[PDB]
Amino acid sequence: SGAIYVGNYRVVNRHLATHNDWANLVWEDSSRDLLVSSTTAQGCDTIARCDCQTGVYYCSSRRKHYPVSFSKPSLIFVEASEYYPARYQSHLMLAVGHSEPGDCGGILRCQHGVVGIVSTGGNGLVGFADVRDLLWLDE
Ligand SMILES: NC(=O)[C@H]1CCCN(C(=O)[C@H]2CCc3snnc32)C1
Numbered sequence: 001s002g003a004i005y006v007g008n009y010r011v012v013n014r015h016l017a018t019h020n021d022w023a024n025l026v027w028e029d030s031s032r033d034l035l036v037s038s039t040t041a042q043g044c045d046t047i048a049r050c051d052c053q054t055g056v057y058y059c060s061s062r063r064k065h066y067p068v069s070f071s072k073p074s075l076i077f078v079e080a081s082e083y084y085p086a087r088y089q090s091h092l093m094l095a096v097g098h099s100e101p102g103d104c105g106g107i108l109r110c111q112h113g114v115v116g117i118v119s120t121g122g123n124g125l126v127g128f129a130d131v132r133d134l135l136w137l138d139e
């Protein structure tokens with residue numbers, strides 16, 4: 001589990017969104033595994049607006065932040081699970097790292113701010129849904 005809290009927005013994995021998220025919906029995209037809802041309180045996270053391919057992510061199944069190198073946001077094939085049919089997820093970045101079911105929502109960050117959230121795992125790989133192109137999160 002986990003979210004990004006920027007401005008009056010809450011960014012979560014679409015597959016983990018709650019009823020309150022759906023009832024206060026701003027934007028959602030199943031192909032990216034992202035959903036954004038509105039919040040009453042202002043958040044403290046800032047979004048990175050950069051070209052980094054190195055950063056650090058939080059892994060809840062290890063209680064640890066790991067440094068990683070990650071690929072550029074791309075259209076990647078993700079294996080069928082109980083949340084999605086085998087398919088192509090867009091704006092996804094891959095790294096080598098531990099990610100097990102329960103780790104989605106952990107933040108990936110660089111020196112500029114939040115880059116994205118854990119969206120996939122398995123095989124010693126971790127996939128991150130990028131948010132750096134969502135410029136409207138800053139307004
Ligand atoms: N964004 C997605 O399509 C994810 C939906 C939630 C489930 N996804 C995963 O990657 C899960 C299922 C297989 C394993 S092993 N460690 N994590 C996972 C895929």
Ligand SMILES: [Zn+2]
Nearest residue numbers: 050052110112
């Ligand atoms: Zn950066």
